[PDB]
Amino acid sequence: RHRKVLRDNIQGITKPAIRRLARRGGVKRISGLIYEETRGVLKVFLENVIRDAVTYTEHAKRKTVTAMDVVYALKRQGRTLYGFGG
C-alpha cells in the first residue's frame, strides 16, 4: 500500500523520442520549442481518452481498466483502433 505521488513524469517523454516521432512523420528539421508543445498536446489527448476509459470502467464496477475499455474509448472519440480485440 505505497503512498503514490507521481510528478514530472511528463518529462519521461524525451527530446530524443519526440524527435524520433517527428522523423517517422517525415519532419526534417525540428524547432527547439516544439518539445514543450508536443508534451502539451499528448497530455491533453491522454486526458480525454483515459477519462472515457475510466468512465466505462467505473460503470462496470471494475477496479481494472481492460484493453476493451480503451478501444471503446478511442472508438468513442472517433479514432478506431484494431488489433486489441472486439
Binding site: 516521432l21 517517422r24 512523420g25 483515459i50 481498466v65 483502433l81
Partner: protein, 95 residues
C-alpha cells in the same frame, strides 16, 4: 562529417520503414498512471491496455507532425514551429 541535415534524411528512411514503438515503456506507463490518479484512484491496468494508449498516442502524434510539416512547407520554411502545430490543431478543429 556529413552535411548537416543529411543524417536526418537517413533517419527518416530508417523510421518510416519499421514498426517498433518509439516511446520507452516505463516512462510512458508512469505517465499514464499519473494522469489516471486524478479521475479515480487506485486503478489496475492490463498491460495490453497501456499498450493500446501508447499505440494510439504515437499513431496520433505522427499524423500531427505530418500535417504540421505540410504547414511549415507551405510557409517556405523547412522547420516546424509551435505556431505551425497550433495552426494544425486549429484547422482540424481538435481545440
Amino acid at each position: 562529417r556529413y552535411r548537416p541535415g543529411t543524417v536526418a534524411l537517413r533517419e527518416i528512411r530508417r523510421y518510416q520503414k519499421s514498426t517498433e514503438l518509439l516511446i520507452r515503456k516505463l516512462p510512458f506507463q508512469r505517465l499514464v498512471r499519473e494522469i489516471a490518479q486524478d479521475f479515480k484512484t487506485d486503478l489496475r491496468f492490463q498491460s495490453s491496455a497501456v499498450m493500446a494508449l501508447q499505440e494510439a498516442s504515437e499513431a496520433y502524434l505522427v499524423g500531427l507532425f505530418e500535417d504540421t510539416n505540410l504547414c511549415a512547407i507551405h510557409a517556405k520554411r523547412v522547420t516546424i514551429m509551435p505556431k505551425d502545430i497550433q495552426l494544425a490543431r486549429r484547422i482540424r478543429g481538435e481545440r
